[PDB]
């Protein structure tokens, strides 16, 4: 019955100030236009232009 | 850098672009290099 049955349980444990940042969860991208006047943001770099 | 001497560092200039880039994050004081290569 409920609450006997076998439990797959994993835990998602991280540490931090042991090494640089190097897990980041997904960056989405929008579609590149020209020609107009924009806020661009290439790898951080933000912009007007 | 190809050269024409196989004598002491040779005389020009030439720059060196990043080859690797890597978020190590360990500590370092001291490197050793590695080489492949009885005694009479
Ligand atoms: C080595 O870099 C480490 C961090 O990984 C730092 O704690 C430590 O100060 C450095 N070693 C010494 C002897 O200072």
């Known amino acids: 019955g409920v609450g006997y049955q076998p439990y797959r349980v994993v835990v998602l444990s991280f540490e931090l100030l042991h090494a640089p940042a190097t897990v980041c969860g997904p ?3 929008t579609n590149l236009v020209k020609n107009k006047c924009v806020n661009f943001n290439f790898n951080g770099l933000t912009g007007t232009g | 850098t ?9 005389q020009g200039f030439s720059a060196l672009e990043p080859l690797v880039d890597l978020p190590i994050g360990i500590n370092i004081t001291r490197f050793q ?3 492949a290569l009885s005694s009479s």
């Open chain 1, 27 to 29: 960056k989405k991208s």
């Open chain 2, 2 to 10: 190809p050269i024409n001497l196989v004598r002491d560092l040779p």
């Open chain 2, 33 to 35: 290099t590695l080489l």
